[PDB]
DNA sequence: CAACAAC
């Protein structure tokens, strides 16, 4: 019951600088967000200026908050739909009805992955079968249509980062060789599923590894 | 905390 502040088994009579693991092992989000191309940074900055001019500085902050909240709500609704036992009325949930009918055999939900040797961590949405094929599934709300996998920006990199980590994480006894990005729409129009077979996942894996090396090179130029 | 999105 008792927790001592001192440790009488020790004595009390270059300095140690022990790294904090959570600070030196990045999340997938952090790696991707800190290594965007100058062109993507430009497009996002030009869009943000247009939004601030249209909405005002506080209006844009509120827009940004609402985009995040809508996404979090969608994922909360999905977590309860995908688990064994007002949130479920949204247009996004309507958007993915035809996808959900092909999803089965859920094996992980909002579950931590850590790559033992590439030193990154993440939290995946979902591992489940889509039309019988076991997938890391990345569910995404989106304001604009994303009818091609190339319309999804870094989403395929997030998918393969989770696959590679999960496949080399001793907390998991199975491997996953396919990915799926599901883009859902607020007006209820049919969601776009972008399936990634093993070949396509291996192609994006190369690109993810480059982003991870860019992040690593960026952090040692900061030290 | 990560992921939650924006192009």
Author numbering: 99 to 111, 119 to 190, 199 to 336
Provide passages from the article that reported this PDB entry.
MGME1 (also known as DDK1) is a highly conserved, mitochondria-specific DNase. Human MGME1 (HsMGME1) protein is composed of 344 amino acids and belongs to the PD-(D/E)XK nuclease superfamily. However, in contrast to DNA2 (2–5) and many other mitochondrial DNases, MGME1 can cleave various types of DNA substrates with a preference for single-stranded DNAs (ssDNA). Structural analysis and comparison suggest that MGME1 follows a two-cation-assisted catalytic mechanism of substrate cleavage.
Details of ssDNA recognition were revealed by the HsMGME1–ssDNA2 complex, which was determined at high resolution (1.75 Å). ssDNA2 (5′-AACAACAACAAC-3′) is 12-nt in length and resides under the helical arch in the structure. As revealed by the structural superposition, binding of ssDNA2 has no obvious impact on the conformation of the helical arch, but it causes significant conformational changes to the β3–α5 connecting loop. Due to structural disorder, the 5′-end A1A2 and 3′-end A11C12 were not observed, whereas the central seven nucleotides (from C3 to A9) and the phosphate group of A10 of ssDNA2 are all well defined in the HsMGME1–ssDNA2 structure. In addition to the stacking interactions between their nucleobases, A4, A5 and C6 also form extensive H-bond interactions with HsMGME1. Like A5, the phosphate group of C6 also forms four direct H-bonds with HsMGME1, via the NE2 atom of His180, the OD1 atom of Asp238, the NZ atom of Lys253, and the NE2 atom of Gln271. The backbone of ssDNA2 is severely bent in-between C6 and A7, resulting in an almost perpendicular orientation between the nucleobases of C6 and A7. The nucleobase of C9 is sandwiched in between the side chains of Ile149 and Phe266, forming hydrophobic stacking interactions with them, especially Phe266. Surprisingly, though 10 mM CaCl2 was included in the crystallization sample, no Ca2+ was bound at the active site of the HsMGME1-ssDNA2 complex. The NE2 atom of His180 forms one strong H-bond (2.7 Å) with the backbone O atom of Trp252 in the HsMGME1–ssDNA2 structure; compared to the HsMGME1–Mn2+ structure, the Trp252–Lys253 amide plane was tilted about 20° in the HsMGME1-ssDNA2 structure. Structural superposition showed that the C-terminal residues are partially overlapped with the DNA substrate; to avoid their potential conflict with DNA, the C-terminal region is shifted away from the active site and completely disordered in HsMGME1–ssDNA2 and all other HsMGME1–DNA complex structures.
